[PDB]
Amino acid sequence: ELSGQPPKFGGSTGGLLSKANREEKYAITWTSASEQVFEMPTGGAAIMNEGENLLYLARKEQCLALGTQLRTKFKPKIQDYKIYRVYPSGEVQYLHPADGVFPEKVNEGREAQGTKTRRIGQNPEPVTIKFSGKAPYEV
Amino acid sequence: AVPATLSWSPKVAGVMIACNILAIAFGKLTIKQQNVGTPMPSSNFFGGFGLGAVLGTASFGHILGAGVILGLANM
Amino acid sequence: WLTFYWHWKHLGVWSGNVAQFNENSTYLMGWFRDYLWANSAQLINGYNPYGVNNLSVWAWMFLFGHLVWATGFMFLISWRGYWQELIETIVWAHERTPLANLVRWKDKPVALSIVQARLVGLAHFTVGYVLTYAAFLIASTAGKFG
Amino acid sequence: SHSVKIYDTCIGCTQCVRACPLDVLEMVPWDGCKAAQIASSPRTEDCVGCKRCETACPTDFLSIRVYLGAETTRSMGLAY
């Protein structure tokens, strides 16, 4: 499964709701060298332990916001945070980072999908592709 | 129907001095920092108090005496 | 503007007092006083602390329009994110209430979209705008003449 | 879900990737620019259409465009 040792937090009302155990939730794990204080994206501040920490949140944006805070708002930076999606059936899908290297930097083994080979000004006219169920970008 | 007050008399002086001495007794045990600030020449006679402590307890004594004297005059 | 002009001119024509419009239509205070303030007297007295006459429905609809027109300003002025945050708080409140978690929604409540907000505000605005003037016109002309 | 498309005017400046808060973009090797890299959007199912990526793009008009479409729980950013 996953690791443990949740950060020392008093809890709040801004945390998980029913969807967490009915649709999906998210997990973020990271190893910190000191037992310090960070800001919970759900309101309030929590103490993260010295060693490994695991935290459950409701949205991927919250996990990535906490990752940004970890990476930027600490003098000894954190680079080993991992974000998984936890399905209600216990199946865990490892989301971020995808290949282990940060997406901001070029790395081999990527597929280059979503790329058009034309300029944005060379898109086909809407009238020509009428009754095709596709917008100009879709072709 | 204004409350009746008291013209100056030795009994009023005694009440004021008693209130002042009770105030100094209160400050002898209630004040946290006492030997602080500008000191007094013969500190022993004031229980090790400083100038600020002496002034504070004396002002508190006059305040307490004023309250007690007015309340007593309005018996 | 068009209908105000037509109505004032024809009120003067029907009453015979064309001089009123001929004099007081050259400055805006005349429009405010001799047309809006002056003719409203019969309308707003449709129902009184002393009684009620046949213009009561028109006074009620007049206030109804003055209300819907103002209601449109919520959607025209305030925008979505505020209401989405408020709805999130309400959702939290409903989910944590005993005896109310038994009943749960099927479609997740959300705030109205931006374009939907503009459309709804404009609709409330237009309905109030039409109803207010319709009530005023009918009531004034019916009380004065009918 | 929303559709994120990258056109051939990208200069491999990586601003769009960093500006994305939901980790939808990525840097892939390329040859059409000096930087020899281009932007890709492999995880568009996680894009919320916040348009920060477009706001970060420095090219004339936009080398990266976001078209909003069908709304799911992820793309609507719902926590409930």
Next chain:
Amino acid sequence: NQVVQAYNGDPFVGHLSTPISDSAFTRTFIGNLPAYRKGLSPILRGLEVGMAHGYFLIGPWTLLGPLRDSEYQYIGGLIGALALILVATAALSSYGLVTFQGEQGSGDTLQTADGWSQFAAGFFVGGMGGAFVAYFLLENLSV
């Protein structure tokens, strides 16, 4: 000492322990309500809930309703309560029809189509019973 802590041992859930969220008295009072009690059939649950919810609805129309002045006052309250309970049963039945029409489970017998339908029927009959007993108490003579 600290009367406020995590909700049921997991802080990360969107709730907090309060002297009214998980106190012993709170759980005891809530857990023994007809909608939350143990070992109660859905039909009987509905009967018990409807009895009270229709009993208390007799009030406002009897004292504030348009017929409060006339002798047709408690009757007006009764009619209002009966109409309200009827519409309530219609809404309950609609909710049951639209909610549990997919997969069916028996972990909770209230959260199933047949269970919810029985709850609605018992709620109807309890509403009638409570409204009528309230009318019988309030209304003078008429016997």
Next chain:
Amino acid sequence: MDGLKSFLSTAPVMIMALLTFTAGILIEFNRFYPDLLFHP
């Protein structure tokens, strides 16, 4: 002073100066010759 002259030549100060000049022109012309509906 260089900075003083530069500040005096900034946009708001200059537009205020021109506006007050024109206002004075109009005020004086209307004090000496009031009620000019047209040129007869």
Next chain:
Amino acid sequence: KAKVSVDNNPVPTSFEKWGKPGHFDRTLARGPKTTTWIWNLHANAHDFDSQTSDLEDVSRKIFSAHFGHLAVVFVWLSGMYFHGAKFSNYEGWLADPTHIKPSAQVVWPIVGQGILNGDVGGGFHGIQITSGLFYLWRASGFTDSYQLYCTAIGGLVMAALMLFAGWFHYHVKAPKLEWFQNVESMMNHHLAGLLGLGSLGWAGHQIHVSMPINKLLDAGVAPKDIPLPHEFILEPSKMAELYPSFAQGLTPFFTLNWGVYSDFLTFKGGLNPVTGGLWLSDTAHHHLAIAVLFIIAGHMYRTNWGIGHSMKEILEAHKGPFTGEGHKGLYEILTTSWHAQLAINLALLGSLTIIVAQHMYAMPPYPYQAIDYATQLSLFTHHMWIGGFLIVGAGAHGAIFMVRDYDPAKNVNNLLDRMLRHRDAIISHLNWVCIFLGFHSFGLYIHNDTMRALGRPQDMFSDTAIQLQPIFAQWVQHLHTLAPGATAPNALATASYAFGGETIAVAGKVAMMPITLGTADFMVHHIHAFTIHVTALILLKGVLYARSSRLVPDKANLGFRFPCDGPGRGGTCQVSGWDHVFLGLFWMYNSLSIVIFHFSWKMQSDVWGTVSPDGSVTHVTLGNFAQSAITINGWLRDFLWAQAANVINSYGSALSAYGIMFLAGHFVFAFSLMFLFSGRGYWQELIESIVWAHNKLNVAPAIQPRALSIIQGRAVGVAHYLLGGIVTTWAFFLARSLSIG
């Protein structure tokens, strides 16, 4: 031998940076590339926190700017004094105050505005003023124009002194940061040296100057036969024959035989039957007691002799079981963040101004004020608007603090953290109470309207129908009326006749009479409660959710003032705290408008009026409030329509300037809707076309024009909207109240 610590000549006094606008900001210093650079210049000016990161530098800037605002206020005050000395009929009004209207503005005749110089009685022609300055001056013992002129000169001199003080204490000798963080010493000096000493000096002035002059004036002495104020000092016998106790001297004060002073230090209460104001001896004992209390209180916090409490100790020592760390950590919050201090002070001062407005009409202090209805209404509305604006600013700058100065590391399990941790509960319960109040309260009005419309008056919520009696306020009024009897034995009359008692009337006009409370008053007070809770909901949600929210989890990185996070998540318009303030401004306007309408109509209908010599009272609107103010149609017909006859018909008289202004108010309001209802993309495209037009003729500007930003558009809309509405209400109230008395 003082805690002072300053730096010498930190900022040179040079003129060059005056010629480089935008110098303070790094971005603006690059000159203008688009028109937005101009707007950012005027907006980023007095925000020093973003300009520099040195807290000491920010503090020095704030200190100097506060000197500047003091200089501006002093210039304004000297202007009022001069314009009352030279261009007023104060000496004329002082002779027959019940027959001469106050007037201190005179209009040059240029294009026919000389019609504005209306007849105020006694052969004087000028604008009637409603600020109540004449009554304040008479209450200060003013009798000559030369004294007012000297006061104006002194105000000018003080303004110059404050300006020089700002220049010195910034550009030459600037205090260090540790000097500012002497919150204990600051509180001591400002509680004792500023408030207590000020009130003591004012009480001395009242006793030694104002009270004898007013006593002589009320007896019929001509305003020129009264001696100059210093004559009561140079000849103490006259003071001793006005008050016998002055013969006794200062001995009873030091012997604590204070009873003999009771001839001029009274506890009368009520109002002066001749001037319609409070007894000046009451204000003397009042300001004296206030001075004594503040002087005592200023000796609380320890500064340099160990005697006294310590704020940090009290803050860390007040904590309970429900609150974890409790009040700990707040001392560093309030001694390192200017915005938190600004928020607290703004909220408290706004509430204080509201209290001033609410208490200043029921106990009219100044002579002949309650008899002047226009002044009462103007002062009430003015200070209430000031209070509302201050409270909204409190909310705004609290949100600013939360975004900027908050640090999670220093607030672990303190009160602030636990606030941030049950905020959903707070907002949910407050939202529910807002909905409940709105529904029940306003639906009462709608229900009454419908019942009246249908010919069902017995089903209404009226006093002759289903009644909603505010029995609690009635009980408290009954109690406060009985206070002179036993609960406050040494008081002669009630604190105010608003609670109950006799009717006090000066000349023929009622000064103050009991203000009963019924069904309509119940509904209006609960409407006030509803509007206030809603405004609090908006501002509190803005403050609590500023850092982040479920929708946007990193709102803090976007700043306090940002328009949106984009059309994503279904649309994220107006999520910042700034937008919360922008939305709260409208609700503050709505609440205060309802409050001032309530005050105006209730006063006109139940209090103000005239008195027949028999003893009967005829009110201005013949007591129609108790039956018409229970429906919206009543507030439309009997208040907005009926009472607007005095303003629309103002053309051709001296009140025309109000009528004009009234229409002006009705215009700008509508104008603001151009900015609230639209968006900047349309205007950007229109500007593109217009720029093409100016480009065709080679006349395009170098500074490329741009449509206003989203935040700027919202700000412009709200500003012009508030201006239009408030100007409308001001013109309406002034024109109405200058036509009834």
Next chain:
Amino acid sequence: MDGSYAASYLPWILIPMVGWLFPAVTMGLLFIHIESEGEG
């Protein structure tokens, strides 16, 4: 309420149906239809 027009009893039943019965029925059916899962 009553009137002198022919068939005065028709409003007595028609108006409640168009005011209560018809709206209740149509909103119930619409709510049922708009929530039926699948068959998109």
